[PDB]
Amino acid sequence: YFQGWQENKSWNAHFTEHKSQGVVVLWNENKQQGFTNNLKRANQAFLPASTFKIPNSLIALDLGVVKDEHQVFKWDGQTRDIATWNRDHNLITAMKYSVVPVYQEFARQIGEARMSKMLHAFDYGNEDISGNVDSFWLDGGIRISATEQISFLRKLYHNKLHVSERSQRIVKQAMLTEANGDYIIRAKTGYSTRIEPKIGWWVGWVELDDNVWFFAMNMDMPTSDGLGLRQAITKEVLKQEKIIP
Numbered sequence: 498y499f500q501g502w503q504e505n506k507s508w509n510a511h512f513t514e515h516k517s518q519g520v521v522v523l524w525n526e527n528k529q530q531g532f533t534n535n536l537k538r539a540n541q542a543f544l545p546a547s548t549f550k551i552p553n554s555l556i557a558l559d560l561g562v563v564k565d566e567h568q569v570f571k572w573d574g575q576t577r578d579i580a581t582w583n584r585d586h587n588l589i590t591a592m593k594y595s596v597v598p599v600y601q602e603f604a605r606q607i608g609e610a611r612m613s614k615m616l617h618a619f620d621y622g623n624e625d626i627s628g629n630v631d632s633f634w635l636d637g638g639i640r641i642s643a644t645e646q647i648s649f650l651r652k653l654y655h656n657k658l659h660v661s662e663r664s665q666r667i668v669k670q671a672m673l674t675e676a677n678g679d680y681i682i683r684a685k686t687g688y689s690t691r692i693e694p695k696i697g698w699w700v701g702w703v704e705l706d707d708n709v710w711f712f713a714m715n716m717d718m719p720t721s722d723g724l725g726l727r728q729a730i731t732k733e734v735l736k737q738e739k740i741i742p
């Protein structure tokens with residue numbers, strides 16, 4: 498059961514408007530239909546970078562590295578570039594502000610053996626954790642494409658990943674990004690800088706009253722000045738398709 502990714506190059510106007518290039522992939526859950534502006538880049542695999550916080554949190558929770566979304570992970574004292582990293586954090590706040598050292602410690606505690614076994618169970622990307630156990634999603638060998646992200650998120654939404662239902666619900670809670678009377682967005686941003694090409698990520702889904710639209714976008718990010726375009730371009734596509742007002 499798969500009809501195919503229906504191409505819609507109309508969305509490229511939003512990329513060129515902001516002098517950007519990239520891909521947006523949408524998936525209508527109720528109708529089982531996928532749509533993208535660039536079928537090739539939709540299957541192009543990249544480093545997941547901070548979007549790896551979704552599987553990392555799941556494993557850490559299911560193994561007991563993280564007890565719940567309230568456990569405090571104390572700042573190790575090292576002053577870092579991002580100001581919000583230099584405080585204590587919980588799972589909600591570590592995901593919101595994308596606190597790498599918190600998740601690097603998660604990976605070290607998970608272990609290379611369990612990280613590989615768990616990502617194979619998740620069917621996540623190329624399932625290659627080669628590199629440092631606490632940095633392989635930043636400069637190692639793991640690659641995931643936008644369509645593979647949607648595939649992974651769909652299983653997470655339906656509690657179908659091979660971790661406990663509780664772990665999956667906690668992560669989906671920590672993914673909450675926006676909510677109003679019209680929609681709910683559960684998503685994770687991402688930014689890959691070490692290995693070329695430099696790209697920005699945004700993967701997640703839009704919850705409506707009677708449907709859910711999964712999305713996974715990436716775009717060339719030569720400078721950090723356009724990080725806001727990850728969400729801005731994604732929403733412009735969502736508004737054009739009448740998914741959000």
Ligand SMILES: *C(=O)[C@](NC(=O)Cc1cccs1)(OC)[C@@H]1N=C(C(=O)O)C(=C)CS1
Pocket residue numbers: 546547548579594595597635636685686687688689690691724
């Ligand atoms: C996750 O993507 C994030 N990105 C970076 O720190 C960029 C890199 C540094 C070394 C290799 S990639 O941490 C891994 C966080 N990402 C975001 C985001 O937009 O999601 C941030 C703005 C904070 S750093």
Ligand SMILES: [Cl-]
Pocket residue numbers: 669670673
């Ligand atoms: Cl929630």
